[PDB]
């Protein structure tokens, strides 16, 4: 470990490092593990001395130190791939750079089953009630919560029952369990210290979860399947496919949902970058971060990049840097990048030329039958009966998007839970409550200003 | 059979017995009973009616805890005591370490207020004290003429010996502070109390159970708010070994042996298990920046970063930490396998500073003229460390008001005339008149006190908010039964000064969540100073103030801050019972990206208050003093066309200033001033904005 | 003092701090004094080293050598408190603060009086007009002013008369006195080296000290001196005093002097 290099003074730390490596070489075959190498090798203005250059000295020689005769192999592991120098990123010294990333929900759940085989969850425990919402928390945090959930279990015994002695009774440990209230109290503990880095995950939702623009569905399905199902037929014609398609129209129509469905078609990684965090990195002048997330997307193969709100940067340095470093045309990596916006007018005209984001297709409001299918899939979100029809709910809501219908049915559900727990000690009334409120806070006058830019393409 | 808890009520020989515990061993209210103890102790205590604690876990004093000589918090049975006897002839003797130079026969003048009318049951060889005038005395009984368990009677007399007995290390000292001696934040001190108490209960549990200990507790926050004495206090409350590790003493020595000093301190800490160790001022240790010139400070953060993981983990010792800012610390210590879950106690509130006053009233010997709730009033933004310094300055002015002018000293030092002396009211004003604002003035984290009854009007919006802040945290299962999630963003807009800031205290006081007051200008100074790390840190330590609420107003001033609140609201805390107020006065000039669903979206226009609402707000404004009801409040609200709550408060303030003007201009009350305020020249109300706010409401429609 | 502490090599500068602390901890009570704390204790990366950190660390914690039975007390002196370390300024390590500041002209009157107890001034001077033009000067500069005023007075005598010998002539310098144009000549040197910062002062303008023109009087006088005898009467009839008042209108009307007269009326700074 890096602090063990920094433990004693210079010189004798080097000798202990070397002697550890010949005894590793004498224990061939072997693995040598080193962490916090950014603390070992920074290349910034933290060079307030030269002993750090002395400690990367002879390490850079011992990556060349074996002559295809020592069976040993390095194991370097530091979180930031950009905070290392490129001297440690030299080929023939560290060639296979790989990420780990935050686990998926299908990974968080099996983390919870592999960290429950000792302390033995009770019969009421299902572990999906914890695994769903634990985004922004790492498996170390999950082990921390299962440990202190076992602690909140262990405060319930050995003091309230007063069976205390020197040797711990393992039989009452075997009778001991853990409850739902224990686990949600564990969730209420100070978990969110795991950071808010962007998530990489395979999506499990597809076009049975959304309805609308089925020709656009089939066209994007062809564009993401037949380049990667038959690349040899593109070799038969000799030209590469273009992997950029533009989305524009009213927002809140489910542009995140269609990206998850088109990534579920390729069973690809879903990465969704958006405006405010890259503006936050840009105000701190950190375009190396957006280069890094695009690069780790390139080794997130296969992946689909979702990106929206072009208009926040369309009017600017940000589109200039990402237009330069989007040009790493690795279309053979099964990657896919898209562009979503609300107003396509104020975009820079350096996008419409080929070799980049090319296909300008309009994303309108969802159809009434399409929003019937959307709520039909969203009975898991909000169950609807047929005493009032879903299309009967779409008689005057023609100018409403998916987010608009989502928030008004959520308002109806809030009124439902309110008037259900109004009684002091289920569908039709709340849907009529949704029908009888005359809110229309949706911009429906943008139809012709979208249509003029659509018929500019003509 | 019975477990010990901490008691606010500091009177010794008092058991805070639960009422189901009365009939098990036949206990009565005025009577006292025997207790079990390690190395055969007997504690005798009279019953206090305290049913809100457990039947087995009963709140007790820390002085009867010290009387038990238990490690602490352990289970002991109760024997009934039908053999109570008052008797006489009890010889009582003090201890030498408490005697700081108190001259002569202090026996009758300290025993007689302590012994009269108490009838306090007192065993042989037990320990108890009083406090007053910055030191009073511990008394230990040498012998009893009745049974070794005895009760103080009015005819009990002592020999006024004048010679204290030599102290022992078996007794826990009384200057060693405890749980009730710290009064910063009770629920946060509860968090640090049952955070790591399981090694404090049993080291053999974590030597026998494979659950990892919570490895390292860090208390960032305000500078020096008892945090070293907080660690000392919990070290006394576990009864384990502690030795202080000073921050700057790591940087005291030269290179090499400072490593040896810290490492051998860490090694003898492991040798002296069970123990807790604490390092203060880690920003002096690890300010890992570009400001870390040289390399021996990197050597200083090394071996601490080693011996975090160089803990054997069969060794069960626990490291304690405190600093000012959490982000100023080296960021490699945040994760797991490193320092564990961290917390800030923060600035104490009005009730917490009232409690630090009452723990400081005990050793003051003060008169009944002072009440110190008035001290608890204007102590906003003032650390209880500076409050203790203020109390010390009050005592110094009290001993500078008299006894340096009475001149009863040439070399004699009479503490009894110092205890007959007392701190007074204008002495506390003069102590307030020194450098109290040395505490930094930041935003305050406080459990609210203004109730929902203090605001009247807009009961439909109030019903919506009482649904929103309580029914997700009463019934989240009913929320997710139908497949839906609770919202977090609410919208407040309209004319300013109507009372929207006033209801933010009440909406958290009703649901008993925590309150933080986020205001636009200090966020603008953080944005101009580019300290948005401080903005996400105040957001994060608001998130660890759960259950809480996030009140933010005047959001139209922003341009980075809107982008970073969109970043931090993406990682929202659904199960931490939090809620976010979006408030402004000009909602049109802000960007419409924030009003999307999944964000702050629940649109409610907040109108100017109505006439009955204005009557309620005027009534709550006049509830601070007895105001005569000779003036009708509806006629005070009759001419008010657009007079908001700010306008009502400045009108009643002008009435109060003119009333006190005519009160003290006389040579050495309500109706005339209210009529003057209603019938003065000014009618300064912005009335044009109602039309455009209704235009915004018709835009929503 | 700071520079002889930081002058020595590493290691024994700590021992210099050791003798500088407990040469007089046995001499209780005693006073220690670690003046110009900007030179010894800043918080900068300008001090690109560690010996100053090793100096100020354990200084701020072995000023706690009073174990509730000693009587060590420290006076702290520096130029500007913002450049001092705030963890040095943290409570316990260092508690509370006061400023001596710049003297005023009224205080310059008696500093000029009590510095001139030895120089045997003549009756021709008046000493009031001397202290007026030197606003924005430190009392050390006034001590310098009267010092080379005396040196100018003894310079035109005692060598022009050729009274120079190995023995002094006490009768000549006793017959000598400083005078008014000597103070003018002292004013004619580079005295404003004490710079022009902000100033606190007890006011003296009292032509319209009672408030403003018409009912501005009756609000101003209550707002600026009725709290200082009657604090509780405001809470007894309900609420706090006002926070601030606005001055607006035509410029240069003496409103700046009016606030000076307001501060003169309430006997405040
Ligand atoms: N909430 C509190 N409860 C009890 N004591 C407090 C509190 N806040 C501040 N203090 C007092 O403030 C002083 C400074 O706190 P601390 O930093 O622990 O002291 P030091 O730096 O001298 O070790 C302590 O003596 C402590 O008694």
Swiss-Prot record, chain B:
Residue numbers of Phosphoserine PTMs: 13, 438, 663
Protein name as it appears in the record: Transitional endoplasmic reticulum ATPase
Top EC class, one word: hydrolase
Sites bearing N6-succinyllysine, chain numbering: 629
The protein's Enzyme Commission number: 3.6.4.6
Phenotype for residue 29 to A: Minor effect on affinity for ATP and ADP
Record keywords, A-Z: Acetylation, Amyotrophic lateral sclerosis, ATP-binding, Autophagy, Charcot-Marie-Tooth disease, Cytoplasm, Disease variant, DNA damage, DNA repair, Endoplasmic reticulum, Hydrolase, Isopeptide bond, Lipid-binding, Methylation, Neurodegeneration, Neuropathy, Nucleotide-binding, Nucleus, Phosphoprotein, Transport, Ubl conjugation, Ubl conjugation pathway
Gene Ontology CC: ATPase complex; azurophil granule lumen; ciliary basal body; cytoplasm; cytoplasmic stress granule; cytosol; Derlin-1 retrotranslocation complex; endoplasmic reticulum
């Amino acid at each position: 470990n890096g602090p063990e290099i920094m433990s004693k003074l210079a010189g004798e730390s080097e000798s202990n490092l070397r002697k550890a490596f010949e005894e590793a070489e004498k224990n061939a075959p072997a693995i040598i593990f080193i962490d916090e190498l950014d603390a070992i090798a920074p290349k910034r203005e933290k060079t307030h001395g030269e002993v750090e250059r002395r400690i990367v000295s002879q390490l850079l020689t011992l990556m060349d130190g074996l002559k295809q005769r020592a069976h040993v192999i390095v194991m370097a592991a530091t979180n930031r791939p950009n905070s290392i120098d490129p001297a440690l990123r030299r080929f023939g010294r560290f060639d296979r750079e790989v990420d780990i990333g935050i686990p998926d929900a299908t990974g968080r759940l099996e983390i919870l089953q592999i960290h429950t085989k000792n302390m033995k969850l009770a019969d009421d425990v299902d572990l999906e009630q914890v695994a769903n919402e634990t985004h922004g928390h790492v498996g170390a945090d999950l082990a921390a919560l299962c440990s202190e959930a076992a602690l909140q279990a262990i405060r319930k015994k050995m003091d309230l029952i007063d069976l205390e002695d020197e040797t711990i009774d393992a039989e009452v440990m075997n009778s001991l369990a853990v409850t739902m209230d224990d686990f949600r109290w564990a969730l209420s503990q100070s978990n969110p210290s795991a950071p808010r880095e962007t998530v990489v995950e395979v999506p499990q939702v597809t076009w049975e979860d959304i309805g609308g623009l089925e020709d656009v569905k089939r066209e994007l399905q062809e564009l993401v399947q037949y380049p990667v199902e038959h690349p040899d037929k593109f070799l038969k014609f000799g030209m590469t496919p273009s992997k950029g398609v533009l989305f524009y129209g009213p927002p809140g129509c489910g542009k995140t949902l269609l990206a998850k469905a088109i990534a579920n078609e390729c069973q690809a990684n879903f990465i969704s970058i958006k405006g405010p965090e890259l503006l936050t990195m840009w105000f701190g002048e950190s375009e190396a971060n957006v280069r890094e997330i695009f690069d780790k997307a390139r080794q997130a193969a296969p992946c689909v990049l979702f990106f929206d709100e072009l208009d926040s940067i369309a009017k600017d340095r940000v589109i200039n840097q990402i237009l330069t470093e989007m040009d790493g045309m690795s279309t053979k990596k099964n990657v896919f990048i898209i562009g979503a916006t609300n107003r396509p007018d104020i975009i820079d005209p350096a996008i419409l030329r080929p070799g980049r984001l090319d296909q300008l297709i309009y994303i309108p409001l969802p159809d009434e039958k399409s929003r019937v299918a959307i709520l039909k899939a969203n009975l898991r979100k909000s169950p609807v009966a047929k005493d009032v029809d879903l299309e009967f709910l779409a008689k005057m809501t023609n100018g409403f998007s998916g987010a608009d219908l989502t928030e008004i049915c959520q308002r109806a559900c809030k009124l439902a839970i309110r008037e259900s727990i109004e009684s002091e000690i289920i569908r039709r009334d709340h849907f009529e409550e949704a029908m009888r409120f005359a809110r229309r806070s949706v911009s429906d006058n943008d139809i012709r200003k979208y249509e003029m830019f659509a018929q500019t393409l003509q | 059979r019975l477990i010990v808890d901490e008691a606010i009520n500091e009177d010794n020989s008092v058991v805070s017995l639960s009422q189901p515990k009365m009939d098990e061993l036949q206990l009565f209210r005025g009577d006292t009973v025997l207790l079990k103890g390690k190395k055969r102790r007997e504690a005798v205590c009279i019953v206090l009616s305290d049913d809100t604690c457990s039947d087995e876990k009963i709140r007790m004093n820390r002085v009867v805890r010290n009387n038990l000589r238990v490690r602490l918090g352990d289970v002991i049975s109760i024997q009934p005591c039908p053999d109570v006897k008052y008797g006489k002839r009890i010889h009582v003797l003090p201890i030498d370490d408490t005697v700081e130079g108190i001259t002569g026969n202090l026996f009758e003048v300290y025993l007689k207020p302590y012994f009269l009318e108490a009838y306090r049951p007192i065993r042989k060889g037990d320990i108890f004290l009083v406090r007053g005038g910055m030191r009073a005395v511990e008394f230990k009984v040498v012998e009893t003429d009745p049974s070794p368990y005895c009760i103080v009677a009015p005819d009990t007399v002592i020999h006024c010996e004048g010679e204290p007995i030599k102290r022992e290390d078996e007794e826990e000292s009384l200057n060693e502070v405890g749980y009730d001696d710290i009064g910063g934040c009770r629920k946060q001190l509860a968090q640090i109390k049952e955070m790591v108490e399981l090694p404090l209960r049993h080291p053999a549990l974590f030597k026998a159970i494979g659950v990892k200990p919570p490895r390292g507790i860090l208390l960032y926050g305000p500078p020096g708010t008892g945090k070293t004495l907080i660690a000392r206090a919990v070290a006394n409350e576990t009864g384990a070994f502690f030795f202080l590790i000073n921050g700057p003493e790591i940087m005291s020595k030269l290179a090499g042996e400072s490593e040896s000093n810290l490492r051998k301190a860490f090694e003898e800490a492991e040798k002296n298990a069970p123990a807790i160790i604490f390092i203060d001022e880690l920003d002096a240790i690890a300010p890992k920046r570009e400001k870390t010139h040289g390399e021996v400070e990197r050597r200083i953060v090394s071996q601490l970063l080693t011996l975090m993981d160089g803990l054997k983990q069969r060794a069960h010792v626990i490291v304690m930490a405190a600093t000012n800012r959490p982000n100023s610390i080296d960021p490699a210590l945040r994760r797991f396998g490193r320092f564990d879950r961290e917390v800030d106690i923060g600035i104490p509130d009005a009730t917490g500073r009232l409690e630090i006053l009452q723990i400081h009233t005990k050793n003051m010997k003060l008169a009944d003229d002072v009440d110190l709730e008035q001290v608890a009033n204007e102590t906003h933004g003032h650390v209880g460390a500076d409050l203790a310094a203020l109390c010390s300055e009050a005592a110094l002015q009290a001993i500078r008001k008299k006894m340096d002018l009475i001149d009863l000293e040439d070399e004699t030092i009479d503490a009894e005339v110092m205890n007959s002396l007392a701190v007074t009211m204008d002495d506390f004003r003069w102590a307030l008149s020194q450098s109290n604002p040395s505490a930094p003035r930041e935003t305050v984290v406080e459990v609210p006190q203004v109730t929902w009854e203090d605001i009247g009007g807009l009961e439909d919006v109030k019903r919506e908010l009482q649904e929103l802040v309580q029914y997700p945290v009463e019934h989240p299962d009913k929320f997710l039964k139908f497949g839906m999630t609770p919202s977090k963003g609410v919208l407040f807009y309209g004319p300013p000064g109507c009372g929207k800031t006033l209801l933010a205290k009440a909406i958290a006081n009703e649901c008993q969540a925590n309150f933080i007051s986020i205001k636009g200008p200090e966020l603008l100074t953080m944005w101009f100073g580019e300290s948005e790390a401080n903005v996400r840190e105040i957001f994060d330590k608001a998130r660890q103030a759960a259950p809480c609420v996030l009140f933010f107003d005047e959001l139209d001033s922003i341009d980075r801050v809107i982008n970073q609140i969109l970043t931090e609201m993406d990682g929202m805390s659904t199960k931490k019972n939090v809620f976010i107020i979006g408030a402004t006065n000009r909602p049109d000039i802000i960007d419409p990206a924030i009003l999307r669903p999944g964000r702050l979206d629940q649109l409610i226009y907040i109108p100017l208050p109505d006439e009955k609402s204005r009557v309620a707000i005027l009534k709550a404004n006049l509830r601070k003093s007895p105001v005569a009801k000779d003036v009708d409040l509806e006629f005070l609200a009759k001419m008010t066309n657009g007079f908001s709550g700010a306008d009502l408060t400045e009108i009643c303030q002008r009435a109060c200033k003119l009333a006190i003007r005519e009160s003290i201009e006389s040579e050495i009350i309500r109706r005339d001033h209210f009529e003057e305020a209603m019938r003065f020249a000014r009618r300064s109300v912005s009335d044009n904005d109602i039309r455009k706010y209704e235009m915004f409401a018709q835009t929503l429609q």
